[PDB]
Amino acid sequence: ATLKYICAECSSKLSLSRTDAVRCKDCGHRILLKARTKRLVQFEAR
């Protein structure tokens, strides 16, 4: 049901706003990856 930020280590799809600091659920991994886009990247197969 939508994801804004994955988290670095547990891969647990977080998604938090401002003043949430930078942590994850159980794995307070202060890192967090930014998860992809849905805007479908197209590619040249060349």
Binding site: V22, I31, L32, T37
Partner: protein
């Protein structure tokens, strides 16, 4: 995302690519001088200080990473991926101290 208010101090690269958290999310193709880390600063309302993509460069975003320092500062790290295809000019060396370009 900055969209100009009272200083308008921004760069020619398009912000059309930054999300509403001011960060391109992975996958998004970025080129020209496209803005990557859309940042803003009130100085003594919106003085844009932001990292646009390097001029000559153009890629696709590989990973945006948001962190915390020891002073707790918010960190962002954008990896921008580009596939580089041997062209004319690219430099190639055998293993005996002779380089040479593709003519």
């Amino acid at each position: 995302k900055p969209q100009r208010t009272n200083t308008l101090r921004m760069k020619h690269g398009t912000y059309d690519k930054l999300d509403d958290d001011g960060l391109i999310a992975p996958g998004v193709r970025v080129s020209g001088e496209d803005v990557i880390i859309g940042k803003t600063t009130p100085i003594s309302s919106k003085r844009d200080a932001s990292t646009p993509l390097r001029s000559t460069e153009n890629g696709i975003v590989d990973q945006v990473l948001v962190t915390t320092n020891q002073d707790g500062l918010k960190f962002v790290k954008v990896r921008v991926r580009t596939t580089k295809i041997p062209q004319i000019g690219d430099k190639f060396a055998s293993r005996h101290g002779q380089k040479g370009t593709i003519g």
